Design a protein around this ligand. Structure first.
Ligand code: A1AYL
Length: 209
């Protein structure tokens, strides 16, 4: 059972800008998604400070980067707090409407796309490199769900019957044909060292057969 939703108009406009604007510095998508993972890990860690049982769904707090050249996907996995179904529908737990408003004023007032994270909508920088994004998520207070969008004004949400995740979020980037450099080990390592050197969780870059 798949539910299809329309993006709010401001979010659709944000994704069309990210997709259509000529902007060569696409690598910041990875910094933005890792920083989102770090924020989600901070949240479950804080909650566990007063309720250890919050970590019954997984004690390890980490970030994995999994490239797959056969599928042409880059997956960013974290064991953070995750998202409820309501969170997924409400712009993946962001205040995306007011965030978009600010970001697009900043853009007309000098800023560039790389600053998207300062407006709380860094998730959508995934569409710099991905034609389709799938988000699998599990929050302690809800079931496992899969969100998906190829932009175009709509997204879907369904119960995920795939591999149980325990707790956290998995962002699966179905990369554009000309963006496969972000599956190469040496290019991912470069980006992580350049932009994510101070993330306080272990970031493991998986290698391929
Ligand atoms: O708004 C613009 N681009 C834009 C905005 C948000 C984005 F996430 C993005 F990738 C590109 C134009 C350059 C200023 C006018």
């Amino acid at each position: 059972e798949v539910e299809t939703f329309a993006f709010q108009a401001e979010i659709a406009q944000l994704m069309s800008l990210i997709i259509n604007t000529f902007y060569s510095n696409k690598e910041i998508f990875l910094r933005e998604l890792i920083s989102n993972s770090s924020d989600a890990l901070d949240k479950i860690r804080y909650e566990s400070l007063t309720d250890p049982s919050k970590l019954d769904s997984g004690k390890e707090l980490h970030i994995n980067l999994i490239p797959n050249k056969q599928d042409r996907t880059l997956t960013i996995v974290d064991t953070g707090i995750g998202m409820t179904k309501a969170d997924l529908i409400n712009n993946l737990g962001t205040i995306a409407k007011s965030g978009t408003k600010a970001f697009m004023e900043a853009l007309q007032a000098g800023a560039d796309i790389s600053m998207i994270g300062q407006f709380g909508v860094g998730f959508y920088s995934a569409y710099l490199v991905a034609e389709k994004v799938t988000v699998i998520t599990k929050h302690n207070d809800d079931e496992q769900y899969a969100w998906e969008s190829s932009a175009g004004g709509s997204f879907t949400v369904r119960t995920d019957t795939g591999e149980p995740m325990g707790r956290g979020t998995k962002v699966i980037l179905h990369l554009k044909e000309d963006q496969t450099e972000y599956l190469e080990e040496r290019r991912i390592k470069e980006i992580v060292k350049k932009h994510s050197q101070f993330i306080g969780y272990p970031i493991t870059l998986f290698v391929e057969k």
